[PDB]
Design an enzyme around this catalytic site. Structure first.
Site, PDB file in Angstrom:
ATOM      1  N   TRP A 142       0.888  -1.157   0.000  1.00 16.37           N
ATOM      2  CA  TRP A 142       0.000   0.000   0.000  1.00 16.37           C
ATOM      3  C   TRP A 142       0.931   1.214   0.000  1.00 16.37           C
ATOM      4  O   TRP A 142       1.732   1.391   0.923  1.00 16.37           O
ATOM      5  CB  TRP A 142      -0.842  -0.027   1.278  1.00 16.37           C
ATOM      6  CG  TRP A 142      -2.052   0.859   1.280  1.00 16.37           C
ATOM      7  CD1 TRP A 142      -2.984   0.981   0.291  1.00 16.37           C
ATOM      8  CD2 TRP A 142      -2.497   1.691   2.358  1.00 16.37           C
ATOM      9  NE1 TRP A 142      -3.988   1.828   0.691  1.00 16.37           N
ATOM     10  CE2 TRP A 142      -3.717   2.278   1.954  1.00 16.37           C
ATOM     11  CE3 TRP A 142      -1.989   1.993   3.628  1.00 16.37           C
ATOM     12  CZ2 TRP A 142      -4.432   3.150   2.775  1.00 16.37           C
ATOM     13  CZ3 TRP A 142      -2.700   2.858   4.441  1.00 16.37           C
ATOM     14  CH2 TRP A 142      -3.910   3.427   4.012  1.00 16.37           C
ATOM     15  N   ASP A 180      -0.802  -5.098   9.539  1.00 18.58           N
ATOM     16  CA  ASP A 180      -1.831  -4.199   9.042  1.00 18.58           C
ATOM     17  C   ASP A 180      -3.035  -5.100   8.770  1.00 18.58           C
ATOM     18  O   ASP A 180      -3.006  -5.923   7.844  1.00 18.58           O
ATOM     19  CB  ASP A 180      -1.350  -3.529   7.741  1.00 18.58           C
ATOM     20  CG  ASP A 180      -2.299  -2.445   7.239  1.00 18.58           C
ATOM     21  OD1 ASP A 180      -3.450  -2.357   7.710  1.00 18.58           O
ATOM     22  OD2 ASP A 180      -1.888  -1.670   6.353  1.00 18.58           O
ATOM     23  N   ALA A 227      -6.587  -4.647   7.736  1.00 18.77           N
ATOM     24  CA  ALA A 227      -7.617  -3.749   7.218  1.00 18.77           C
ATOM     25  C   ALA A 227      -8.826  -4.413   6.565  1.00 18.77           C
ATOM     26  O   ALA A 227      -9.873  -3.778   6.406  1.00 18.77           O
ATOM     27  CB  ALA A 227      -6.986  -2.758   6.250  1.00 18.77           C
ATOM     28  N   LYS A 244     -13.567  -0.684   6.333  1.00 15.64           N
ATOM     29  CA  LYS A 244     -14.155  -1.558   5.335  1.00 15.64           C
ATOM     30  C   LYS A 244     -15.074  -2.673   5.845  1.00 15.64           C
ATOM     31  O   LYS A 244     -16.157  -2.873   5.283  1.00 15.64           O
ATOM     32  CB  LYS A 244     -13.068  -2.106   4.409  1.00 15.64           C
ATOM     33  CG  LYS A 244     -12.331  -1.018   3.626  1.00 15.64           C
ATOM     34  CD  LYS A 244     -10.860  -0.943   3.988  1.00 15.64           C
ATOM     35  CE  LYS A 244     -10.150   0.122   3.150  1.00 15.64           C
ATOM     36  NZ  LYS A 244      -8.688   0.005   3.234  1.00 15.64           N
TER      37      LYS A 244
HETATM   38  C1  LIG Z   1      -8.025   0.507   4.319  1.00 18.90           C
HETATM   39  C2  LIG Z   1      -6.660   0.297   4.551  1.00 18.90           C
HETATM   40  C3  LIG Z   1      -6.041   0.862   5.687  1.00 18.90           C
HETATM   41  C4  LIG Z   1      -6.791   1.737   6.665  1.00 18.90           C
HETATM   42  O1  LIG Z   1      -7.617   2.723   6.125  1.00 18.90           O
HETATM   43  P1  LIG Z   1      -8.420   3.678   7.088  1.00 18.90           P
HETATM   44  O2  LIG Z   1      -9.528   4.351   6.141  1.00 18.90           O
HETATM   45  O3  LIG Z   1      -7.465   4.687   7.584  1.00 18.90           O
HETATM   46  O4  LIG Z   1      -9.143   2.863   8.081  1.00 18.90           O
HETATM   47  C5  LIG Z   1      -4.746   0.599   5.942  1.00 18.90           C
HETATM   48  N1  LIG Z   1      -4.038  -0.200   5.115  1.00 18.90           N
HETATM   49  C6  LIG Z   1      -4.597  -0.759   4.017  1.00 18.90           C
HETATM   50  C7  LIG Z   1      -3.788  -1.696   3.153  1.00 18.90           C
HETATM   51  C8  LIG Z   1      -5.887  -0.523   3.711  1.00 18.90           C
HETATM   52  O5  LIG Z   1      -6.396  -1.106   2.574  1.00 18.90           O
HETATM   53  O1  LIG Z   2      -7.774   2.242  -2.106  1.00 18.55           O
HETATM   54  C1  LIG Z   2      -7.180   1.759  -1.124  1.00 18.55           C
HETATM   55  O2  LIG Z   2      -6.042   1.269  -1.214  1.00 18.55           O
HETATM   56  C2  LIG Z   2      -7.864   1.775   0.229  1.00 18.55           C
HETATM   57  C3  LIG Z   2      -8.570   3.094   0.529  1.00 18.55           C
HETATM   58  C4  LIG Z   2      -7.644   4.211   0.925  1.00 18.55           C
HETATM   59  C5  LIG Z   2      -6.781   4.787  -0.004  1.00 18.55           C
HETATM   60  C6  LIG Z   2      -5.926   5.828   0.357  1.00 18.55           C
HETATM   61  C7  LIG Z   2      -5.932   6.304   1.665  1.00 18.55           C
HETATM   62  C8  LIG Z   2      -6.792   5.736   2.606  1.00 18.55           C
HETATM   63  C9  LIG Z   2      -7.642   4.694   2.229  1.00 18.55           C
END
Ligand SMILES: *Cc1c(COP(=O)(O)O)cnc(C)c1O
Ligand SMILES: O=C(O)CCc1ccccc1
Ligand SMILES: *Cc1c(COP(=O)(O)O)cnc(C)c1O
Lengths: 394, 388
Positions: free
Chosen positions: B121, B202, B204, B237
């Protein structure tokens, strides 16, 4: 690895709490509380706020990611509430934050981002959290005289003399109104002089606007801020909705960056958005939506201003009563400052010894610096506090 | 002063969000058949209950509410939750949990380095760069097989040293969709204990892979093996409350003393950053989790989402099979989670959006939840026309 962690000291708001709760005295009083409490000792949810939540529950269809730096409705409504008709959208950058504290932290990150050799000037005294955040960030902190221990008023000559030492690029933190913890405030004329010193020095002002509406009124409380805004090119404002909207736990704040030109505004807005991203991506939505809803819905905005006004007037009457009681008991008008102070807090000017003696002999609790919360007072507790003050020789 | 501010690089993924016969396959948000991200039934009922029961909005817990902390600890670690050695901190979403995780670790180890998966990410690296932390990468994705290069991962991880932090995705790997099996996890636990590296997990997408309990399997395995571990969880999510900003950081320690140290430092961290954490989303989550009727319906709805997406993956794989006359794209059915990377190069990806109106992240990451019966064959054909 975590064993190498240095122990961090607790809040302290709880140490005072544990002591108060442990006291078996039936007549114990708590003037150390830092939130508003009505006559029944409760912190209610404002009518308009409860109305907004009912409304949101019926109209909201999704909770997907929203605006990175906040929602336009919120940014605009907050800007208008603080700056009124003087709001220059072309040169104002806005950022929704996690409460006023979040706005403060971000303001500091932004300034340091633009000026690494930043020095910050804070009042003597000031909200303890200001120094804590700054110490944590490693920022150089400087103090300027403010509270006059003898008159319980503002030592303006001292404040001016100290601020004169500020250099271009330094930051001067000012409470927009209802100075926490003192309750001693600057007059519009004194504000005007402060503006002159700021123009002269080239220091960047950061206004902590957390109590708009608890002083003399919504517009009245923003007067000092609006003067600074119109005479100074760059201004940083960290506002809070916690107290004046009564949504403490929702964490709704706002950082306003007043810039000299649109080009700079885009630069500031981008850096602010970046700051939210690297800290927590998006800011909380619930509280902000409650606020914008109250502000945009005429019926609600009306009821909100009415409830806030009732609150302000109520505290102001508590001040008048206490001052009168103290006048009758003291046989002098020494404590008249109580009726002159604005906000829910006031520093009585008692020493730690006097503070301890008041607690031990009268069961009245307050912050160690003699700060009391006016809202925690009433018809039954005022006579007691007054007598206590006189008896301990304050 | 402000005129000295250098311009910042925008968020690539969220950039497309603004840019958007258009087909949105970017941002990792769950969408239904009609392109809507709905509010979960239990979440809605929870908010309705909250409106009736809350009598005040005064300041609450600096580290979050006990109810939230406990429920979340149980959701993640299950019966492997040792409260006496676990410190919990409510945060502003999972991203806030990550940032707070990095600050806690750096305080305990000023010289820490962070190992991140290749790829990972993007927001992981941006935050680390901002903080000024040294980032090493470990092999993870196998571009050829579209699976995991476990042999390379084991090699790179073995080079880590004590004090270093290894960032692992608990399940549903963003952006690849390639995941470790429980056997591979046990193997990773061995390396972690041999090197003394601190794992930061992580979490999520718990509930979007193979199931609530199953998605936590790997996390529970590391937690039982490694004495000290950090877990950054997001409720965005799996509870569909993205904009509420709710998640939490869990710090598993070897003893109660260290637990006390960690807890204090974590509370301090919230205090210096924004004071108290947001209440609304955390309250919704604990209300759902502690109310049997609500938890039941939530699990059912989450399962429906999970199964649905899985169905979509198979549909997409099949469609492509017919059109390509091959099974190269089989990997799509094996990947688990919200995302999956195809393989299309930057130029191909760009052509696709500028004419077909279908937006996917520059690295060919697609949100399968964005597809349906209508758009699947369209996508399938579109990738065929874009060739390679
Ligand atoms: C969604 C996500 C998060 C956390 O997102 P928040 O909107 O801040 O809760 C962190 N890491 C990954 C890989 C994600 O997909
Ligand atoms: O699209 C994603 O990878 C998850 C959503 C997201 C993207 C960027 C910042 C916070 C959450
Ligand atoms: C309350 C307060 C703040 C901020 O409150 P938040 O709860 O963070 O919204 C900032 N400064 C002062 C002086 C305050 O009294």
């Amino acid at each position: 690895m975590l064993g190498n962690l240095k122990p961090q000291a607790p809040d302290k708001i709880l140490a005072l709490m544990g002591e108060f709760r442990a006291d078996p005295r039936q007549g114990k009083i708590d003037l150390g509380v830092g939130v508003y409490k009505d006559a029944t000792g409760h912190t209610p949810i404002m009518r308009a706020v409860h109305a907004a939540e009912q409304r949101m529950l019926e109209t909201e269809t999704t909770k997907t990611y929203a605006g990175l730096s906040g929602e336009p409705e919120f940014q605009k409504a907050m800007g208008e509430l603080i700056l009124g008709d003087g709001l220059k959208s072309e040169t104002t950058a806005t950022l929704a934050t996690v409460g006023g504290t979040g706005a403060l932290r971000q303001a500091l990150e932004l300034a340091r981002m633009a000026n690494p050799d930043l020095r910050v000037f804070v009042s003597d005294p000031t909200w303890p959290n200001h120094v804590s955040i700054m110490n944590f960030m490693g920022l150089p902190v400087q103090t300027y005289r403010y509270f006059d221990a003898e008159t319980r008023g503002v030592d303006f000559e001292g404040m001016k003399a100290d601020l004169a030492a500020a250099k271009k690029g330094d930051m001067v933190l000012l409470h927009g109104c209802c100075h926490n913890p003192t309750g001693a405030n600057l007059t519009l004329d004194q504000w005007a002089e402060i503006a002159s010193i700021l123009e002269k020095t080239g220091a960047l002002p950061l206004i902590d606007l957390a109590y708009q509406g608890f002083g003399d009124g919504l517009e009245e409380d923003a007067a000092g801020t609006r003067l600074i805004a119109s005479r100074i090119p760059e201004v940083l404002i960290a506002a809070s909705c916690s107290k004046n909207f009564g949504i403490y736990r929702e964490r709704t704040g706002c950082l306003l960056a007043l810039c000299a030109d649109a080009a700079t505004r885009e630069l500031a807005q981008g850096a602010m958005a970046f700051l939210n991203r690297q800290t927590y991506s998006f800011p909380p939505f619930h509280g902000a939506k409650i606020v914008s809803t109250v502000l945009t819905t005429p019926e609600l905005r009306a009821d909100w201003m009415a409830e806030l006004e009732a609150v302000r007037s109520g505290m102001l009457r508590l001040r008048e009563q206490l001052a009168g009681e103290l006048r009758d008991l003291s046989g002098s008008d020494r404590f008249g400052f109580v009726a002159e102070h604005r906000g829910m807090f006031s520093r009585l000017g008692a020493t730690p010894e006097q503070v301890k003696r008041i607690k031990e002999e009268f069961g009245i609790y307050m912050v160690g610096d003699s700060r009391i919360n006016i809202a925690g007072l009433n018809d039954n507790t005022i006579p007691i506090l007054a007598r206590a003050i006189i008896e301990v020789g304050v």
